[PDB]
Amino acid sequence: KYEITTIHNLFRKLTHRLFRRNFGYTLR
Amino acid sequence: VARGWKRKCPLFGKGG
């Protein structure tokens, strides 16, 4: 559970972006 | 920043 951790916290209503645009630069 | 995967839910962090 990652996307729902960075896209459900404050991006619950924000196009899933921080998923790989914020937490993707690390797991890259 | 890595505070939304460890601080929010200990799934990707503690559990990871």
UniProtKB/Swiss-Prot annotation, chain A:
Changing R17H: In THPH10; Oslo; decreased affinity for dermatan sulfate. Changing K13T: Reduced heparin- and no dermatan sulfate-activated inhibition. Expressed predominantly in liver. Also present in plasma. Changing K13M: Reduced heparin- and no dermatan sulfate-activated inhibition. Phosphorylated by FAM20C in the extracellular medium. Residues 1-21 are annotated as: Glycosaminoglycan-binding site. The N-terminal acidic repeat region mediates, in part, the glycosaminoglycan-accelerated thrombin inhibition. It is linked to Thrombophilia due to heparin cofactor 2 deficiency: A hemostatic disorder characterized by a tendency to recurrent thrombosis. Thrombin inhibitor activated by the glycosaminoglycans, heparin or dermatan sulfate. In the presence of the latter, HC-II becomes the predominant thrombin inhibitor in place of antithrombin III (AT-III). Also inhibits chymotrypsin, but in a glycosaminoglycan-independent manner. Belongs to the serpin family. This is Heparin cofactor 2. It comes from Homo sapiens. The chain holds residues 192 to 219 of 499 of the full protein.
